[PDB]
Amino acid sequence: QELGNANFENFIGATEGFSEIAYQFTSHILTLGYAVMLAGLLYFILTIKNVDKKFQMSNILSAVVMVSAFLLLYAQAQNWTSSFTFNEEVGRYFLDPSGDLFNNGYRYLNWLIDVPMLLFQILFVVSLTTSKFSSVRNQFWFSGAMMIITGYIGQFYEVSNLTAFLVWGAISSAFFFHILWVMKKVINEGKEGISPAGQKILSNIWILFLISWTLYPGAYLMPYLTGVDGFLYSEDGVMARQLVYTIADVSSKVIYGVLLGNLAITLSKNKEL
Amino acid sequence: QELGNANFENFIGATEGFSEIAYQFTSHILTLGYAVMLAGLLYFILTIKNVDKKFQMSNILSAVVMVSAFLLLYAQAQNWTSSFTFNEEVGRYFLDPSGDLFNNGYRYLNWLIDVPMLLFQILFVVSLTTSKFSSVRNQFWFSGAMMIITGYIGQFYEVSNLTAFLVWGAISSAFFFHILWVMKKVINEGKEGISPAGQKILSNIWILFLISWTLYPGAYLMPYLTGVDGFLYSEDGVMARQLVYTIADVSSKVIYGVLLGNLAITLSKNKEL
Amino acid sequence: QELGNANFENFIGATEGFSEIAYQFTSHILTLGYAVMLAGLLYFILTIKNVDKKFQMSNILSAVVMVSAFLLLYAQAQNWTSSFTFNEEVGRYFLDPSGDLFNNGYRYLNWLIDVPMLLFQILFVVSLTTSKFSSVRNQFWFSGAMMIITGYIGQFYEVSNLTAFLVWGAISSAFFFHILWVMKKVINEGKEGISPAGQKILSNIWILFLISWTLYPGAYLMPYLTGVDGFLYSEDGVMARQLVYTIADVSSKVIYGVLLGNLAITLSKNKEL
Amino acid sequence: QELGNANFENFIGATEGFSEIAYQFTSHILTLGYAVMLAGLLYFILTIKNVDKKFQMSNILSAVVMVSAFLLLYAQAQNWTSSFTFNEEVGRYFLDPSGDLFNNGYRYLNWLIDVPMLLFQILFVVSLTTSKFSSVRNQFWFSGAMMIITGYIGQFYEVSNLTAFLVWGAISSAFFFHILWVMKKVINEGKEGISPAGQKILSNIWILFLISWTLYPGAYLMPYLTGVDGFLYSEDGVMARQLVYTIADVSSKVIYGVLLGNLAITLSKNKEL
Amino acid sequence: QELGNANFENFIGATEGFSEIAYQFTSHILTLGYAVMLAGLLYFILTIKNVDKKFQMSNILSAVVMVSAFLLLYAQAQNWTSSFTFNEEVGRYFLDPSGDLFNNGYRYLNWLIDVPMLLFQILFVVSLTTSKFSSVRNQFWFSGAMMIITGYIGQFYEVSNLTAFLVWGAISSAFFFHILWVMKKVINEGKEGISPAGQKILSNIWILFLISWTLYPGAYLMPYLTGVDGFLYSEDGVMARQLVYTIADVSSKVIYGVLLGNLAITLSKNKEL
Ligand SMILES: CCCCCCCC/C=C\CCCCCCCC(=O)OC[C@H](O)CO
Ligand SMILES: CCCCCCCC/C=C\CCCCCCCC(=O)OC[C@H](O)CO
Ligand SMILES: CCCCCCCC/C=C\CCCCCCCC(=O)OC[C@H](O)CO
Ligand SMILES: *C/C=C(C)/C=C/C=C(C)/C=C/C1=C(C)CCCC1(C)C
Ligand SMILES: *C/C=C(C)/C=C/C=C(C)/C=C/C1=C(C)CCCC1(C)C
Ligand SMILES: *C/C=C(C)/C=C/C=C(C)/C=C/C1=C(C)CCCC1(C)C
Ligand SMILES: *C/C=C(C)/C=C/C=C(C)/C=C/C1=C(C)CCCC1(C)C
Ligand SMILES: *C/C=C(C)/C=C/C=C(C)/C=C/C1=C(C)CCCC1(C)C
Ligand SMILES: CCCCCCCCO[C@@H]1O[C@H](CO)[C@@H](O)[C@H](O)[C@H]1O
Ligand SMILES: CCCCCCCCO[C@@H]1O[C@H](CO)[C@@H](O)[C@H](O)[C@H]1O
Ligand SMILES: CCCCCCCCO[C@@H]1O[C@H](CO)[C@@H](O)[C@H](O)[C@H]1O
Ligand SMILES: CCCCCCCCO[C@@H]1O[C@H](CO)[C@@H](O)[C@H](O)[C@H]1O
Ligand SMILES: CCCCCCCCO[C@@H]1O[C@H](CO)[C@@H](O)[C@H](O)[C@H]1O
Ligand code: NA
Ligand code: NA
Ligand code: NA
Ligand code: NA
Ligand code: NA
Ligand code: NA
Ligand code: NA
Ligand code: NA
Ligand code: NA
Ligand code: NA
């Protein structure tokens, strides 16, 4: 059976198949994912007036990201259940090509919304000092797009061409390091001339950002993090990848948005928190 | 046939199958469930302005839980009708593995929204005295997460390994007892320095909370509450489990939210009821 | 063919099948049903501020019922088209058990929202005199639940056990008569000490309530209202039942809600009719 | 192949089948239809505050009609693609009875919302001089209902019984002429005592109303407007019917609603166009 | 096999089929498309109050376009995955006629919303000088309709009749040039009597408009832009066409709407950027 430039989920599914626990867990974690995003959409809309007018764009951009993430995770939850079907003889779920092959690439192109908007929205809460707004925005958006597109190309080859997978991944990582660099400056400048309570929130935002964003390259490498024929090149690695994505999605989008909202409240003249 | 680590609904469905009443009732009760949650979402949004600004976060968190519960019960309603198909020869509904096995685990991971948010929202209505907000929140969220995850692992073994089922269930129960303990403190402190009308509502909330939350471990054990080859290890137990879930869902999420809203009104300077 | 405890729609569908007109009409009338409810949801939300704050809960409860009725009629519309499939050889639609048997019981459990909320909402518009709010509410909700649950059990036996059908129906009818009794008291007390305009609307509400609610037991009996092998034990009775449900649904939920809104306007100090 | 009392789309589909252009166009025009209605729903809600309070009910009733038309055209768009399936051997789309026969009757029962509400809403913008509001409303609603129900019965016989088709159509046309008569009076009285700009809009509304509403009986007769075995008794007539419906739907519901909104603005003390 | 007047996607799909990358990418880019539009819908609604009342109609018309584009791209995303199915033997996705042939014509008829509304909305932000509002609107709408309808007819013949394809395309292009001419006048008059900041935004809008709108005829010609049996008459051309549509959709609808919003803010007495 030729699968070509397909994600490793399809190779595990076509050879060993998935146990009840592996198949059900992956469905459950994607379902939790899209439920969090629709709940988050409601939260960010309903709390718009908790902050001064100038900060409300951050709530709006959080809502924009919630719409993207809800739609994508809802679609992927259906893609999972469509791509793997129970075999009564062996009692496992095997690749069902009539559902299409499963592909994580759905996430990557939707990041062309998420990444630009997540990076942009902090610039509506913090005030820059030494950095120029337009310059930070342009660097975030350029490096964001390049990081996503190079990684997108890479993940198609995660089984078919390990070399292409690692080279494209390495190129993507360079743009990622640039984003980390710029965001660190933005957090530092944001701390300047605000209450200590605001400064503490920005310290928390930086840690959240660094960990949550690093989880995505972690999900990229997941199948090979225990090397060739390792523990993770298995249904266990399939489960781990979607779990890491869901932790990263909730952390990078919802918790990030909530912390920015809390910062906006502290910076708001009327509001106290 | 080989079903592995699957819920007992699939064993009943694959051996005896379900009568018209058992199959239809389970579909009906899940449909009522998701209808209550979407109706509740509308209620919590439309009543936001019935309470002082400081209490409105409770309405918002109720709405967040309604989104989670609606999405999950809607999905599970479809999962039920997909997993069991009419056999014309015998006139009963039998396991249809092309629909996937039925799994209650969908509920468990979505509780990672419901439980944390339900426990959190009371802290936006009552005032603590001796207990610290952040400390109560952290205990609720840590013990809530551990209770859910341990029970989640357990329910996969409810047929395949009764020992694992009972041990994981027992560990989960310990975290549950801790939650009951902390919530009792919160209700007691909440009663201090408020009107007798408010105190009565908090007394009602405690009883509602204790009964509604205890129904979940009840649903966990349901198939075995009449022992080996008991009355409940049957389509009658399948019906009973989803009925208990729906009573618990409506009670723990909607009625809880309504009572908290009514408490917020009594604590609101402008508002009266 | 063995259908067990199934609604008579399935017996007609499995024996005679449905003509184009019978099949299409039943689909059309259910589609009109769910369209009216979603349109009504929009109407009740958009007119909230047309009445004094104290009356707005009636708009909210109308909206809650609209959500329930929309969801249920939308689901039942799909259930109808799934349960009956065209046979090319004879040119009629026959029972397709792969879609599941058709069951009116979906409506019954959703009445656990509709009935309690419809009975409750009038208590936010009229003022009681001799009766206590909590007492009327409790009687409405207790007798409402018992009426629904006993009728729900009954309708499963409408073909398989005419005796059980009529006995459960009779028990349900007793609870219905109690509801009619309590609602008559509520209307009488509501008329006391209000404008003639208000009194006229309450007279209209009583007639609407009495006729619209009585249509439901009419739908229950429909197949047998022309006796054994009568005109209505046919596709014509199948059509008649869903037509009566749709007239009852629109009358009891939407028109009732509109009249209560109009009553609220007349009782509103700020608002004018 | 026995189709019985079915619309002519099914006879063309079962005999000649549909070319790529005929099948795709019909799908496209229904898709445009439902898109216009959901976009219109948003427009009528967002512009509510552009007119004086007394005129806002017209926006609300426009929104109500948008909900009905969106739901119906969305359902019919799916019904079209379900009822006709590609035959690879000849490269045409043929009747697929597993999808159900296609029926325009879906539209007719939903007109029980559209027609009453479209006729009603003008009475919240114009002021009558000779005519009583309640009397005009009752005439519109009675004649609207009778026009719809008689036409609904007729269209089932458009192939099976040309005589029934034409007689029911003729009876329906009588009620239609009554509606045209009453609406002409309403427009004339509406022009009395308003600005010339308002009078011009009402002149436009009358022309729009007369043409857009006459398109519906045009769609009814479409297959036979070129006589027996004429050009229109073909895939070309199938296309023409749905095109005429979509022009009529957009004109009678959206453009009508926009012109009424524009009239309301001119009659509004605060507002100007 | 015989495909008749069908888009070239179906010819590639039926002969060579699509690689994993070609099939998945096309699905991903359409998914991004509809996600951007629903996120944009939320953005345009939530930012309505960021501009003076007189400019808010531009936000409303942006929202209207978002509804159209979301619905269309969502439907087309499903049409793509329905029209091509994995062949296990060769590991490619081939035409699945049971899903219907794929057709870009869905986009064209929905442009009867998008094009008229996009051209109209600028007239609620800029002030004309020498040109009449009604005259510019009428020219936009007439030439817009003719451009769309002629191109719509053309694209059905892109394989079956290259001559019809190029002639209808040429006629469509003439109406397009007229639109470019009128929009240039509108931009010029719009620049008169506004701040240099406003003039810069209008310069950007003109460039965006010219490039984004020209991408549509580019997508029309895509398969033949490398001549007969060129590189683009392939899965690579299929990918390129949907990529160009998505870039054009985001640019012409969302970015255009955002720039108009930014212009409205600069022209707003209360607000500043
Ligand atoms: C055994 C087979 C025969 C069965 C035939 C049944 C006949 C039922 C007739 C009337 C229902 C009256 C029920 C009483 C309603 C109780 C209301 C209630 O529970 O609320 C009390 C309220 O609080 C006050 O203070
Ligand atoms: C076959 C090759 C195609 C040739 C390419 C044609 C391009 C120009 C088309 C039309 C120009 C004028 C059309 C204007 C249509 C009416 C709108 C209008 O100008 O009227 C406004 C009214 O006067 C209120 O002020
Ligand atoms: C802005 C986003 C766009 C990104 C999407 C990329 C898709 C590339 C599309 C077109 C390039 C091809 C231009 C064609 C120029 C070559 C002409 C040619 O090859 O000659 C024709 C042939 O030789 C005579 O028979
Ligand atoms: C919610 C969406 C977010 C925050 C997306 C973030 C995505 C990344 C940080 C992706 C990074 C990658 C690498 C650093 C290397 C491998 C390829 C990527 C794109 C997964
Ligand atoms: C609406 C969601 C709610 C209130 C969820 C509550 C869940 C529980 C209280 C679960 C408790 C469990 C045990 C104590 C033992 C067995 C495993 C669990 C997780 C079902
Ligand atoms: C919109 C929902 C409403 C108003 C539901 C009303 C339901 C009833 C009045 C049901 C009555 C019944 C009987 C009195 C006898 C037979 C069984 C029932 C439940 C259909
Ligand atoms: C959007 C809904 C509208 C405006 C509905 C209008 C429907 C009609 C004017 C129908 C008229 C008919 C006749 C006059 C004869 C044939 C049967 C009808 C019902 C199509
Ligand atoms: C978002 C929708 C937009 C902006 C649509 C624009 C459509 C066009 C500019 C279409 C132009 C065409 C030609 C100039 C020639 C070929 C046929 C068309 C219709 C694609
Ligand atoms: C930085 C992390 C990258 C480490 C690369 C590890 C090389 C993995 O090696 C690969 O493992 C697969 C599954 O085990 C095998 O099927 C492949 O044949 C093999 O190339
Ligand atoms: C704390 C409540 C747990 C009670 C444990 C009951 C033990 C049931 O025992 C189990 O019952 C099943 C169904 O009858 C049988 O199929 C199994 O063989 C048997 O092990
Ligand atoms: C309306 C309340 C009383 C109704 C009782 C009517 C008795 C119905 O009688 C039933 O009729 C069915 C269809 O005709 C038959 O198939 C059954 O054999 C017969 O028991
Ligand atoms: C007012 C318009 C009514 C005209 C009705 C006359 C047309 C009836 O002609 C019908 O045409 C069908 C297809 O062309 C044939 O299949 C039928 O046999 C024939 O009766
Ligand atoms: C202005 C751009 C239009 C250029 C028209 C080029 C003519 C293309 O020629 C066509 O190429 C197809 C694909 O290779 C072939 O299948 C056709 O047989 C051939 O007619
Ligand atoms: Na599956
Ligand atoms: Na598929
Ligand atoms: Na089923
Ligand atoms: Na499946
Ligand atoms: Na069907
Ligand atoms: Na089924
Ligand atoms: Na089709
Ligand atoms: Na079907
Ligand atoms: Na596919
Ligand atoms: Na199909």
Short mmCIF file of N, CA, C and O in Angstrom, two decimals, chain D residues 110-160:
data_model
loop_
_atom_site.label_atom_id
_atom_site.label_comp_id
_atom_site.label_asym_id
_atom_site.label_seq_id
_atom_site.Cartn_x
_atom_site.Cartn_y
_atom_site.Cartn_z
N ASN D 110 -43.18 27.25 3.82
CA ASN D 110 -42.36 28.31 4.47
C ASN D 110 -42.93 29.69 4.12
O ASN D 110 -42.70 30.62 4.91
N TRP D 111 -43.67 29.82 3.02
CA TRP D 111 -44.36 31.08 2.63
C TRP D 111 -45.41 31.45 3.69
O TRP D 111 -45.81 32.63 3.75
N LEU D 112 -45.84 30.48 4.50
CA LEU D 112 -46.78 30.70 5.63
C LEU D 112 -46.12 31.62 6.67
O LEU D 112 -46.85 32.24 7.46
N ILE D 113 -44.78 31.68 6.69
CA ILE D 113 -44.03 32.74 7.42
C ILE D 113 -43.91 33.96 6.52
O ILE D 113 -44.38 35.05 6.91
N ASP D 114 -43.29 33.78 5.35
CA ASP D 114 -42.77 34.89 4.50
C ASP D 114 -43.92 35.84 4.12
O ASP D 114 -43.80 37.05 4.37
N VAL D 115 -44.99 35.30 3.54
CA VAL D 115 -46.09 36.10 2.93
C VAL D 115 -46.78 36.92 4.02
O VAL D 115 -46.86 38.14 3.91
N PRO D 116 -47.29 36.29 5.10
CA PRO D 116 -47.92 37.05 6.18
C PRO D 116 -47.01 38.16 6.74
O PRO D 116 -47.52 39.23 7.01
N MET D 117 -45.72 37.89 6.90
CA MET D 117 -44.77 38.83 7.56
C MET D 117 -44.40 39.97 6.59
O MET D 117 -44.31 41.12 7.05
N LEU D 118 -44.21 39.66 5.31
CA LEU D 118 -43.87 40.67 4.27
C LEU D 118 -45.05 41.65 4.12
O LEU D 118 -44.81 42.87 4.03
N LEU D 119 -46.28 41.13 4.09
CA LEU D 119 -47.51 41.95 3.95
C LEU D 119 -47.71 42.79 5.21
O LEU D 119 -48.09 43.96 5.09
N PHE D 120 -47.43 42.20 6.38
CA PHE D 120 -47.63 42.83 7.71
C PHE D 120 -46.67 44.01 7.89
O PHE D 120 -47.11 45.06 8.40
N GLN D 121 -45.41 43.85 7.51
CA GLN D 121 -44.32 44.77 7.94
C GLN D 121 -44.55 46.18 7.36
O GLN D 121 -44.16 47.16 8.04
N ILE D 122 -45.16 46.30 6.18
CA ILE D 122 -45.37 47.64 5.54
C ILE D 122 -46.29 48.47 6.45
O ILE D 122 -46.14 49.71 6.47
N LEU D 123 -47.17 47.82 7.21
CA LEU D 123 -48.18 48.47 8.08
C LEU D 123 -47.51 49.09 9.31
O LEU D 123 -48.19 49.83 10.05
N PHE D 124 -46.22 48.84 9.52
CA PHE D 124 -45.43 49.46 10.62
C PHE D 124 -44.61 50.65 10.10
O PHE D 124 -43.89 51.27 10.90
N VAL D 125 -44.70 50.94 8.80
CA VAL D 125 -43.93 52.05 8.16
C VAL D 125 -44.91 53.11 7.64
O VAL D 125 -44.75 54.28 8.02
N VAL D 126 -45.89 52.72 6.82
CA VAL D 126 -46.90 53.65 6.25
C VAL D 126 -48.01 53.87 7.28
O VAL D 126 -48.18 53.02 8.18
N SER D 127 -48.73 54.99 7.15
CA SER D 127 -49.97 55.31 7.90
C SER D 127 -51.16 55.16 6.96
O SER D 127 -51.17 55.81 5.89
N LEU D 128 -52.13 54.32 7.33
CA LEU D 128 -53.41 54.17 6.62
C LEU D 128 -54.25 55.44 6.85
O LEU D 128 -54.00 56.14 7.85
N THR D 129 -55.18 55.74 5.94
CA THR D 129 -56.08 56.93 5.99
C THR D 129 -57.54 56.46 6.13
O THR D 129 -58.18 56.80 7.14
N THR D 130 -58.03 55.70 5.15
CA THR D 130 -59.40 55.12 5.12
C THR D 130 -59.43 53.76 5.81
O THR D 130 -60.45 53.43 6.44
N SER D 131 -58.36 52.97 5.65
CA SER D 131 -58.33 51.52 5.99
C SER D 131 -57.96 51.33 7.47
O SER D 131 -57.16 52.13 7.99
N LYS D 132 -58.52 50.31 8.12
CA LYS D 132 -58.15 49.90 9.51
C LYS D 132 -57.01 48.89 9.46
O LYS D 132 -57.11 47.91 8.69
N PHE D 133 -55.97 49.12 10.26
CA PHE D 133 -54.75 48.29 10.41
C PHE D 133 -55.14 46.81 10.55
O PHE D 133 -54.69 45.99 9.72
N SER D 134 -55.95 46.48 11.56
CA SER D 134 -56.35 45.09 11.92
C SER D 134 -57.07 44.42 10.75
O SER D 134 -56.88 43.21 10.54
N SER D 135 -57.87 45.18 10.01
CA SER D 135 -58.70 44.69 8.88
C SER D 135 -57.80 44.33 7.69
O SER D 135 -57.97 43.24 7.11
N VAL D 136 -56.88 45.23 7.33
CA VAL D 136 -55.88 45.01 6.25
C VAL D 136 -55.03 43.79 6.62
O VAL D 136 -54.86 42.92 5.76
N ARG D 137 -54.54 43.73 7.86
CA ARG D 137 -53.69 42.61 8.36
C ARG D 137 -54.44 41.29 8.16
O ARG D 137 -53.84 40.35 7.59
N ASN D 138 -55.69 41.23 8.61
CA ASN D 138 -56.54 40.00 8.58
C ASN D 138 -56.77 39.56 7.13
O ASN D 138 -56.73 38.35 6.87
N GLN D 139 -57.01 40.51 6.23
CA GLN D 139 -57.26 40.23 4.79
C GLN D 139 -55.99 39.65 4.17
O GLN D 139 -56.07 38.63 3.46
N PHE D 140 -54.85 40.30 4.42
CA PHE D 140 -53.51 39.86 3.96
C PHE D 140 -53.27 38.41 4.41
O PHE D 140 -52.91 37.56 3.57
N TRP D 141 -53.48 38.13 5.70
CA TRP D 141 -53.14 36.83 6.33
C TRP D 141 -54.08 35.72 5.83
O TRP D 141 -53.59 34.62 5.52
N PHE D 142 -55.38 36.01 5.73
CA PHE D 142 -56.39 35.02 5.27
C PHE D 142 -56.12 34.66 3.81
O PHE D 142 -56.02 33.46 3.49
N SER D 143 -56.04 35.67 2.93
CA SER D 143 -55.86 35.48 1.47
C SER D 143 -54.46 34.90 1.18
O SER D 143 -54.34 34.08 0.26
N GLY D 144 -53.46 35.32 1.96
CA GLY D 144 -52.09 34.78 1.89
C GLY D 144 -52.08 33.28 2.15
O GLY D 144 -51.54 32.53 1.32
N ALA D 145 -52.69 32.85 3.25
CA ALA D 145 -52.80 31.43 3.67
C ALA D 145 -53.50 30.62 2.57
O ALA D 145 -52.99 29.55 2.19
N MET D 146 -54.64 31.11 2.06
CA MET D 146 -55.47 30.39 1.07
C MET D 146 -54.71 30.29 -0.26
O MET D 146 -54.73 29.21 -0.88
N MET D 147 -54.07 31.38 -0.68
CA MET D 147 -53.23 31.41 -1.91
C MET D 147 -52.17 30.30 -1.82
O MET D 147 -52.03 29.52 -2.78
N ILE D 148 -51.47 30.22 -0.68
CA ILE D 148 -50.33 29.29 -0.47
C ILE D 148 -50.85 27.85 -0.47
O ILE D 148 -50.29 27.02 -1.21
N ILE D 149 -51.88 27.56 0.32
CA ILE D 149 -52.37 26.17 0.55
C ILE D 149 -52.92 25.61 -0.77
O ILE D 149 -52.62 24.44 -1.08
N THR D 150 -53.67 26.41 -1.54
CA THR D 150 -54.29 25.97 -2.82
C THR D 150 -53.18 25.70 -3.84
O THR D 150 -53.25 24.65 -4.51
N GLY D 151 -52.20 26.60 -3.95
CA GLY D 151 -51.03 26.43 -4.84
C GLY D 151 -50.20 25.21 -4.45
O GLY D 151 -49.72 24.49 -5.36
N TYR D 152 -50.03 24.99 -3.14
CA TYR D 152 -49.27 23.86 -2.56
C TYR D 152 -49.87 22.54 -3.06
O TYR D 152 -49.13 21.66 -3.56
N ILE D 153 -51.18 22.40 -2.93
CA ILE D 153 -51.94 21.21 -3.40
C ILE D 153 -51.71 21.06 -4.91
O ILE D 153 -51.34 19.96 -5.35
N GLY D 154 -51.86 22.16 -5.66
CA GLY D 154 -51.74 22.18 -7.12
C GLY D 154 -50.42 21.62 -7.63
O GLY D 154 -50.45 20.82 -8.58
N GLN D 155 -49.29 22.04 -7.04
CA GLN D 155 -47.94 21.80 -7.63
C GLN D 155 -47.58 20.30 -7.57
O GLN D 155 -46.76 19.87 -8.40
N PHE D 156 -48.20 19.54 -6.66
CA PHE D 156 -48.04 18.06 -6.57
C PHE D 156 -48.55 17.38 -7.86
O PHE D 156 -48.12 16.24 -8.15
N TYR D 157 -49.42 18.05 -8.62
CA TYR D 157 -50.13 17.45 -9.78
C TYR D 157 -49.61 18.04 -11.10
O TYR D 157 -50.22 17.76 -12.16
N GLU D 158 -48.50 18.79 -11.05
CA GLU D 158 -48.00 19.56 -12.22
C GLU D 158 -47.68 18.60 -13.37
O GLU D 158 -47.70 19.06 -14.53
N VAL D 159 -47.42 17.32 -13.09
CA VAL D 159 -47.18 16.29 -14.14
C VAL D 159 -48.33 15.28 -14.14
O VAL D 159 -48.83 14.97 -15.24
N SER D 160 -48.75 14.80 -12.97
CA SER D 160 -49.68 13.65 -12.80
C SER D 160 -51.11 14.01 -13.19
O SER D 160 -51.87 13.09 -13.53
#
